Amino acid sequence: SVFLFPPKPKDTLMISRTPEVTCVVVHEDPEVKFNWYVDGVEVHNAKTKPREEQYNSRVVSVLTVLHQDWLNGKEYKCKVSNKTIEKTISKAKGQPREPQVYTLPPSREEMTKNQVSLTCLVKGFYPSDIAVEWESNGQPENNYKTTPPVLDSDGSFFLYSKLTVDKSRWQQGNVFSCSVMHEALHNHYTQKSLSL
Amino acid sequence: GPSVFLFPPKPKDTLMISRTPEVTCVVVDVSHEDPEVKFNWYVDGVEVHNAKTKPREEQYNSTYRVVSVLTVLHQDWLNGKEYKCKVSNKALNSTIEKTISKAKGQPREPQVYTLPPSREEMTKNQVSLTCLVKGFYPSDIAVEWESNGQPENNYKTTPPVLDSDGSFFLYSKLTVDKSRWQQGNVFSCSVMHEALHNHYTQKSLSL
Numbered sequence: 452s453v454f455l456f457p458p459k460p461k462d463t464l465m466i467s468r469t470p471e472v473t474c475v476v477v478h479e480d481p482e483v484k485f486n487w488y489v490d491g492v493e494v495h496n497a498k499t500k501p502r503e504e505q506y507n508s509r510v511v512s513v514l515t516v517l518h519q520d521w522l523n524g525k526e527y528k529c530k531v532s533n534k535t536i537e538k539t540i541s542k543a544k545g546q547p548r549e550p551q552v553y554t555l556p557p558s559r560e561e562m563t564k565n566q567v568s569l570t571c572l573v574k575g576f577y578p579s580d581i582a583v584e585w586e587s588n589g590q591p592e593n594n595y596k597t598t599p600p601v602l603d604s605d606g607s608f609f610l611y612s613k614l615t616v617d618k619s620r621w622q623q624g625n626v627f628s629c630s631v632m633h634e635a636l637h638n639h640y641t642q643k644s645l646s647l
Numbered sequence: 648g649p650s651v652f653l654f655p656p657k658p659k660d661t662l663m664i665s666r667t668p669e670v671t672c673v674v675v676d677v678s679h680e681d682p683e684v685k686f687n688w689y690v691d692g693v694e695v696h697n698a699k700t701k702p703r704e705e706q707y708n709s710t711y712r713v714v715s716v717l718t719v720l721h722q723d724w725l726n727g728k729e730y731k732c733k734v735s736n737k738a739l740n741s742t743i744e745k746t747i748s749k750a751k752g753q754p755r756e757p758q759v760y761t762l763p764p765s766r767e768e769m770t771k772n773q774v775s776l777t778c779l780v781k782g783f784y785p786s787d788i789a790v791e792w793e794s795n796g797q798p799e800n801n802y803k804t805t806p807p808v809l810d811s812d813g814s815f816f817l818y819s820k821l822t823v824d825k826s827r828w829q830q831g832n833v834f835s836c837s838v839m840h841e842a843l844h845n846h847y848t849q850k851s852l853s854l
């Protein structure tokens with residue numbers, strides 16, 4: 452069993468982070484080998500994290516990739532070997548489309564609660580690789596949860612991010628902002644603010 | 648060896664006494680050479696005998712697939728009974744066992760809030776009507792949209808999302824033509840869940 456994983460969306464969009472692809476493999480002294488190919492041609496800058504013994508009786512190899520390589524759609528072939536299995540992944544193919552970002556205040560009806568919901572609708576983006584964060588006065592907020600991307604009826608994706616705050620923090624007029632990073636956006640990043 | 652997959656009833660099915668909730672046990676990779684299999688069904692570990700097994704269906708990869716459907720009492724699912732399907736075959740003289748039930752935990756009532764389109768989205772030809780459903784447990788839920796009796800076609804609903812208090816939430820988005828929203832048409836988000844009175848609630852939204 453060989454499983455290939457893509458880099459984190461955030462890591463491919465900021466030139467300062469390190470986007471990896473993670474080839475996971477998953478007890479009679481099994482040796483394993485690893486060959487990495489980028490659009491067919493092989494590369495020798497992988498790294499094999501040390502063996503992991505599981506409760507059921509999990510070797511991993513990690514290859515750093517270039518930001519513009521992943522985003523241009525190059526195929527990443529991970530080839531195992533044990534005395535032969537392959538996997539390939541790439542970015543989803545297609546014209547990237549720019550997320551529209553809309554912040555939605557809490558319902559009047561929710562205002563009878565002690566905490567309230569601040570909503571960030573992110574729609575019309577493609578491919579589904581995206582990252583969403585919340586902050587206020589520069590410091591990130593922690594109490595938020597973001598739905599997975601959902602396929603919309605036009606072949607673009609959407610998601611919602613919900614930020615839970617004390618109603619008083621909302622009543623006091625604090626500024627909350629939803630951050631979105633996506634490849635189709637200008638400088639890969641956009642912000643939208645929400646206040647009372 | 649074969650493989651067994653056990654599917655729960657649909658959330659609308661268990662919530663409405665008029666519908667027919669079913670647990671479905673599907674066996675794939677049943678050998679072509681000797682394909683006789685047996686289903687044993689158990690409810691809370693007590694064998695039941697009213698399941699309905701389909702005839703084998705020959706697949707296009709030289710295997711067989713067999714389906715058994717167990718009709719469930721609505722209050723049996725909501726009361727958390729466990730459904731085991733056991734699949735036995737004389738081909739390998741082996742047995743595979745799967746168990747499914749409603750997720751354990753105290754049910755919690757969803758709060759349903761409807762959020763109008765953003766002002767910034769009003770420059771588009773279509774606007775987003777949002778239904779926020781939060782604080783519900785377990786995650787089994789159904790969400791629909793309608794207007795003036797008739798249902799609406801152009802909506803999508805996110806999967807349930809585990810929130811930080813252990814309950815679930817989701818959002819449903821209804822896309823409508825800006826004109827329809829600006830005419831004052833009333834739109835309703837309908838939510839179905841065991842912890843709601845009559846298993847159903849409805850919130851409206853208009854300009």
Ligand SMILES: *[C@@H]1O[C@H](CO)[C@@H](O[C@@H]2O[C@H](CO)[C@@H](O[C@@H]3O[C@H](CO[C@H]4O[C@H](CO)[C@@H](O)[C@H](O)[C@@H]4O[C@@H]4O[C@H](CO)[C@@H](O[C@@H]5O[C@H](CO)[C@H](O)[C@H](O)[C@H]5O)[C@H](O)[C@H]4NC(C)=O)[C@@H](O)[C@H](O[C@H]4O[C@H](CO)[C@@H](O)[C@H](O)[C@@H]4O)[C@@H]3O)[C@H](O)[C@H]2NC(C)=O)[C@H](O)[C@H]1NC(C)=O
Nearest residue numbers: 452454456457458459470471472473475477505507508509
């Ligand atoms: C005994 O040992 C273990 C028991 O623990 C078993 O291992 C499990 O086997 C399962 C099947 O054999 C397998 O299920 C598949 O899951 C994958 C998805 O894997 C992710 O999700 C799992 C559950 O959520 C995790 O446990 C996995 O570890 C993995 O999670 C993490 O995902 C991260 C994403 O945030 C990612 O981290 C990022 O990696 C990038 C890489 O670029 C960057 O580094 C970045 O910085 C990171 O954030 C990681 O990859 C990963 N975490 C790690 C590596 O630490 C799923 O795709 C797959 O589905 C395939 O097949 C189905 C067919 O049904 C098909 O529908 C799909 O299309 C797809 O083709 C399976 O569902 C488990 O993942 C796996 N657990 C492991 C390996 O830890 C063994 O199998 C047992 N031995 C046996 C049975 O013999």
Ligand SMILES: *[C@@H]1O[C@H](CO)[C@@H](O[C@@H]2O[C@H](CO)[C@@H](O[C@@H]3O[C@H](CO[C@H]4O[C@H](CO)[C@@H](O)[C@H](O)[C@@H]4O[C@@H]4O[C@H](CO)[C@@H](O)[C@H](O)[C@H]4NC(C)=O)[C@@H](O)[C@H](O[C@H]4O[C@H](CO)[C@@H](O)[C@H](O)[C@@H]4O)[C@@H]3O)[C@H](O)[C@H]2NC(C)=O)[C@H](O)[C@H]1NC(C)=O
Nearest residue numbers: 650652654655671672673675676706707708709710712714
């Ligand atoms: C020979 O051909 C056979 C026929 O295709 C192959 O059978 C297939 O075998 C695979 C596994 O090898 C099964 O995969 C599982 O599917 C589950 C979901 O299946 C539902 O959805 C699929 C579409 O995605 C659909 O085709 C199925 O028929 C099934 O539909 C549901 O059916 C029930 C009952 O009828 C109904 O109530 C539902 O409404 C209906 N749903 C929908 C949407 O239509 C997955 O859940 C399984 O995942 C398990 O394993 C995963 C491991 O990664 C794990 O992540 C999961 O959590 C879970 O543990 C699994 O993916 C196929 O269903 C099966 N096909 C059929 C038609 O039964 C056979 O494999 C092949 N053999 C060879 C050697 O090639």
Ligand SMILES: *[C@@H]1O[C@H](CO)[C@@H](O)[C@H](O)[C@H]1NC(C)=O
Nearest residue numbers: 735736737738739740741742
């Ligand atoms: C056949 O199945 C029975 C029931 O589990 C088991 O006791 C028996 O050992 C199996 N046959 C063989 C040859 O092991």
